[PDB]
């Protein structure tokens, strides 16, 4: 007579797990007790960041007329965005290379 | 009870202030009377339509809903009175 197992992520209306995020908060040893708003809130901010960066990744791929996302598109997508750059200044992307950022005086006249 | 000359009820300074809101700097003297006329014909259309709405309703008082409704069927919808 138990209720149907319905997901907490859909209770959030979201896709990143309340379950996995709550589990890595509990077993990441960050506090003795963890409030219920904590994993849904943090899954929400990860889903916002993920949706934003894959939006920019998809636009970067279609700008290069290509279909499948590549870390070149990801690295391009990160350092077009100022607040993403301020978020990820000290992080290096695998196989991403460097976006073309050429200083002006070394360019020919 | 009868009224005769309410075209001049919309005064010349009222017309000048209207054109101030529309961003007109200089308003020539021929403008006021024919703008009274085009305001007249605009209200002839709008009020004829709205009064036709009222007499469709078997009501006797014109309502603001019919004014905005007769506005909206002329592609001139208004916001702020129950539309």
């Amino acid at each position: 007579a138990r209720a149907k197992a319905k997901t907490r992520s859909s209770r959030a209306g979201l896709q990143f797990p309340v379950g996995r995020v709550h589990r890595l908060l509990r077993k990441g040893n960050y506090s003795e007790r963890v409030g219920a708003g904590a994993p849904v809130y943090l899954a929400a901010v990860l889903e916002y960041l993920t949706a934003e960066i894959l939006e920019l990744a998809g636009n970067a791929a279609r700008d290069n007329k290509k279909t499948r996302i590549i870390p070149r598109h990801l690295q391009l997508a990160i350092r077009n965005d100022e607040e993403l750059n301020k978020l990820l200044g000290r992080v290096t992307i695998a196989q991403g290379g460097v976006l073309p950022n050429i200083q002006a005086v070394l360019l020919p006249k | 009870k009868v009224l005769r000359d309410n075209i001049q009820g919309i005064t010349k300074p009222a017309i000048r202030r209207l054109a101030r809101r529309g961003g007109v700097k200089r308003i020539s003297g021929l403008i006021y009377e024919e703008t009274r006329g085009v305001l007249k014909v605009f209200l002839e259309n709008v009020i004829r339509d709205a009064v036709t709405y009222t007499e469709h309703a078997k009501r006797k008082t014109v309502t603001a809903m019919d004014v905005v409704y007769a506005l909206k069927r002329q592609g001139r919808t208004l916001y702020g009175f129950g539309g």
């Binding site: - | 309410n6 919309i10 809101r21 961003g23 007109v24 085009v38 209200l43 006797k60 603001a64």
Partner: protein, 97 residues
């Protein structure tokens, strides 16, 4: 001598003062008299709600100020700053009435 501004800058002061303002520039009582007069021209002994008079007042307000911004476009078309009523006849024709 009393101070006098040049012809035009008082008009532009009125301009700027009135897009910063929102107030309905038409006097309430003669507008209500006019709407009763035009309605009486068609069908008799006809009463108007005050809300109807006011609503029709911003209606006519916006209709004419749209006509004046359009005729200002017609005037800067015509290399002019003083509009003349053929601008309004043009605007009526090319809007389609």
């Amino acid at each position: 001598k009393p101070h006098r501004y040049r012809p035009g800058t008082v008009a532009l002061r009125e301009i700027r003062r009135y897009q910063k303002s929102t107030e309905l520039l038409i006097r309430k009582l003669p507008f209500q008299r006019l709407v009763r007069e035009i309605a009486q021209d068609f069908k008799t002994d006809l009463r108007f709600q005050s809300s109807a008079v006011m609503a029709l007042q911003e209606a006519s307000e916006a209709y004419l100020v749209g006509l004046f911004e359009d005729t200002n476009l017609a005037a800067i078309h015509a290399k002019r700053v003083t509009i003349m009523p053929k601008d309004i006849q043009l605007a009526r024709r090319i809007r389609g009435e």
